Amino acid sequence: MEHDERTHVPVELRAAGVVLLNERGDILLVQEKGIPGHPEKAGLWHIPSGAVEDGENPQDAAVREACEETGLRVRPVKFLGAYLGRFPDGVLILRHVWLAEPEPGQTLAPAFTDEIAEASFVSREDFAQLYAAGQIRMYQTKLFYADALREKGFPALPV
Template structure:
């Protein structure tokens, strides 16, 4: 018997800065409230995934990004729903060498982290496994 819960289409942005650090947000709302993850959220009706990843990243971090390609898909159990997330590799549009993310929307914090910094953070379930499998962990 298949999963009969409604699926909610979402996107995630995998963004690195010039030093290879990964953009992360501290989630303020479910799913995974209080944990760290890549920026992202729901795809609005009539919105493309590419447009959604640009909008969500801007809302949560203040950074303008350009979607490059789909990295993969993850499923996250929610309260009575399943979030089906398409994660996109994105580049920062801003030309400055050190883009500074600023938390907004449902993000409590937004930072670029290197590999050492990543190990100190409480990550949302499955994020590290997915990023590792796609070969996009920070340097």
């Protein structure tokens, strides 16, 4: 919108994920297999998310990725936000996040790969511990988890 000129900033990559909360306000997180190189790794945690195919709807991608990584069919409830990152080579990536809910009567069955060690529901209290411990890959996860808790009417994160 509106008549103030601006140039286009091409975004080569797009990712879409979800902040999936269960009835208790626990968050579904995915753990990386291990850290790249040093000690005997111990992967960090992040929200279920993946690449949006070129031209495909980001919201649908978030739903698809969530199922592919956790085995759970989820329903997008509300868009929470998108943020921008830039890889060393200059490539831009726009990450999208939706507040989602799992369809009823499902069993968590993560897709173990060279990138995913497992996935699981983590309570607000333990999430606070993970965050303080530097175990949450992207700090934005805490920001969006907080947004989701507010949206659903759940208690805020202790830390």
